[PDB]
Amino acid sequence: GAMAPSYRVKRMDIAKNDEECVVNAANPRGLPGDGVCKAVYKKWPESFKNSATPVGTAKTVMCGTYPVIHAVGPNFSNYTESEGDRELAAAYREVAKEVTRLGVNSVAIPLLSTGVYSGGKDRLTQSLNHLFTAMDSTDADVVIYCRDKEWEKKISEAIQMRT
Ligand X SMILES: Cc1c[nH]c2ncc(C(=O)OCCn3ccccc3=O)cc12
Supply the minimum distance, in Å, between the C-beta of residue 111 and ligand X: 7
Cα separations in angstroms, 6 against 46, 48, 134, 141, 143: 30, 29, 14, 5, 8
Shortest distance (Å) from residue 4 CB to Cl ion: 27
Regarding 10 and contact with Cl ion (CB under 5 A), the answer is no
Q: Strand 22-25's sheet: what is its strand order?
A: 7-11, 141-146, 106-110, 22-25, 66-71, 58-63
By CB under 6 A, tell whether 5 contacts ligand X.
no
For 14-160, strand residue ranges (E) read 22-25, 58-63, 66-71, 106-110, 141-146
Residue stretches of the annotated binding site for ADP-D-ribose:
13, 27, 35, 115-117
User: What part of residues 99-128 is at the interface with ligand X (CB under 6 A)?
Assistant: 114-115, 118, 122
| 148 binds ligand X per the rule CB under 6 A | yes
Q: How many residues bind ligand X (CB under 6 A)?
A: 8
> Nearer Cβ to ligand X, position 50 or 149?
149
Name the binder of 12 from Cl ion, ligand X, none, CB < 5-8 A by kind: Cl ion
**Which among 81, 78, 95, 80 is positioned nearest to 130, based on CA atoms?**
95
Exactly one of 35, 52, 152, 156 binds ligand X (CB under 6 A); which one? 35
Interface residues with ligand X (CB under 6 A) are: 35, 114-115, 118, 122, 147-148, 151
